[PDB]
DNA sequence: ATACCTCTTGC
DNA sequence: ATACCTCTTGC
DNA sequence: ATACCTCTTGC
DNA sequence: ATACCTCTTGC
């Protein structure tokens with residue numbers, strides 16, 4: 001919705017809806033994980049990676 | 050000027066000015082003239098002209 | 099061989115043919131208030147002269163000194179750019195000299211401590227228009243009914259072009275006439291240009307691409323302002339405008355990082371006069387108590403010791419950067435100054451003004467070379483690169499060559515370069531001041547940029563208006579036609595030769611504050627003497643000139 | 658529409 | 669009779 | 680609880 | 691009986 005006001009102001013109202021789908025989690029736990037692509041960086045010149 | 054109102058109406062005001070120049074007429078008379086390009090139409094197939 | 103007829107004057111309450119519509123005043127008022135505030139009111143008037151434009155058209159011109167840059171090593175010389183050219187002329191008055199004479203300046207500067215800009219308004223009157231008609235006997239007649247046009251861009255729709263940046267404001271002498279300048283403005287354009295040197299092989303790309311249609315903007319007075327037409331009897335006047343902007347100080351600071359805080363206690367004092375009897379701290383540099391920002395040593399020296407933050411900063415020079423439209427020098431705030439300069443050491447940061455007779459150059463002096471100078475602020479906030487240096491963290495000293503970079507060692511293998519040229523130390527701890535005014539050739543106030551984020555200051559003027567700035571004032575002679583005119587024709591129209599004169603008067607108001615003695619010793623003060631004495635007076639011919647003067651004379655603690 | 662070198666013999 | 673590129677620092 | 684391609688034949 | 695280098699964060 002665009003609603004024009006005095007003096008050229010507009011009030012834009014945007015609505016939006018969705019059907020959302022969701023599965024049960026893999027596991028009901030909180031986990032603390034470490035990620036390690038050492039190998040890739042191990043390369044030399046692959047710092048950015 | 051554009052002046053925005055409620056409900057998306059606008060009032061457009063346009064001003065305009067000019068410097069106008071004007072010479073005296075060729076003659077202070079009213080004339081009744083006839084124009085005749087007979088010759089051109091005389092052609093045959095030149096009706097439109 | 100006629101006088102035109104002399105035409106006869108009708109009379110209203112604010113004007114007519116033989117009725118003056120204004121009053122000349124170029125006088126300056128100081129009005130002392132309670133608590134040492136002063137209200138300075140400065141009036142100023144001029145007789146302005148103006149001719150009809152070259153042509154009643156707006157033009158879009160491109161300028162191209164390709165040849166000069168074509169040179170290789172002449173990057174800096176690039177003048178390329180586009181611009182719209184109008185038939186209008188601009189009346190700019192933004193410049194110290196328009197408003198004050200020296201005497202004034204003196205006062206201000208010696209007795210005050212800070213200055214605020216307050217309001218400003220102007221007006222035009224006693225308008226006159228004449229026509230020239232011509233054996234070359236030129237004759238001049240008033241054209242009673244012709245008009246002068248005037249437009250005031252209060253909305254600030256036009257792009258802003260302060261004219262002092264080119265020394266085109268009005269004159270600085272009340273007793274001598276002057277004129278407005280022809281208005282023009284930048285027009286967008288794309289452009290490329292690869293830097294090079296003497297030694298540089300071939301032809302570095304160097305071209306004018308054209309115009310980003312996106313970036314296009316073309317304005318016209320006519321379509322954006324209302325134009326007033328004045329006849330002799332008419333007169334025009336702007337309202338009064340009020341400024342919203344910080345104050346400007348008239349004092350300078352002098353402490354540098356070195357002078358902040360409690361100096362070290364000297365365990366040992368001199369016992370007789372003489373400039374060689376120093377005092378002594380009397381403690382091993384590596385044994386003193388105190389604080390530093392250096393985690394490795396135990397050294398504590400006036401240069402090591404910690405300071406609360408940092409005055410001044412260092413930046414690259416001479417730096418040219420480049421964007422869409424070509425290169426340009428990177429500006430600095432600071433400048434330099436001091437003992438190790440003397441206008442010859444004169445570097446980056448100090449500004450330099452150049453100008454004509456209307457603005458200070460000796461009136462009688464012949465020859466079209468501009469007069470000049472380099473303003474050297476009193477505020478000791480700049481840098482002395484030569485003194486800089488950098489060293490390895492290990493900080494083992496005395497230091498080894500391998501562990502230190504000097505202003506002497508050459509960078510990029512170029513001899514005449516060193517880190518200080520590309521160095522930069524600005525940062526959250528930096529602290530500094532605004533430029534100081536420059537009499538008489540300095541701009542006074544300036545518009546702020548419409549960017550989302552903003553400069554903390556401008557270098558061209560001390561007063562930057564926060565909100566809107568007073569709209570520009572344009573004028574122009576109204577076209578006076580002959581009896582022949584054919585707009586349908588391609589040729590340029592012929593006009594009667596016409597021109598105009600009118601007086602302009604303005605009022606600019608500041609508000610300031612008296613200063614007061616705080617130290618035992620007296621301080622610096624501007625003053626006249628045998629040496630400069632003649633700068634302030636006309637020559638036996640009427641030679642006049644206005645020399646530049648300083649502004650922040652007195653000192654102030656910084657901390 | 659003149660007041661002691663400004664505004665201001667005002668207010 | 670100048671307000672942030674219009675009217676419109678209005679109303 | 681439908682009004683002239685929105686909000687909104689509302690207020 | 692501390693206010694932004696005076697009087698004076700007074701009045």
Ligand SMILES: [Mg+2]
Nearest residue numbers: 252253670676
């Ligand atoms: Mg307006």
Ligand SMILES: [Mg+2]
Nearest residue numbers: 252253674676
């Ligand atoms: Mg506006």
Ligand SMILES: [Mg+2]
Nearest residue numbers: 310311312313
């Ligand atoms: Mg584009």
Ligand SMILES: [Mg+2]
Nearest residue numbers: 310312313422
């Ligand atoms: Mg672009």
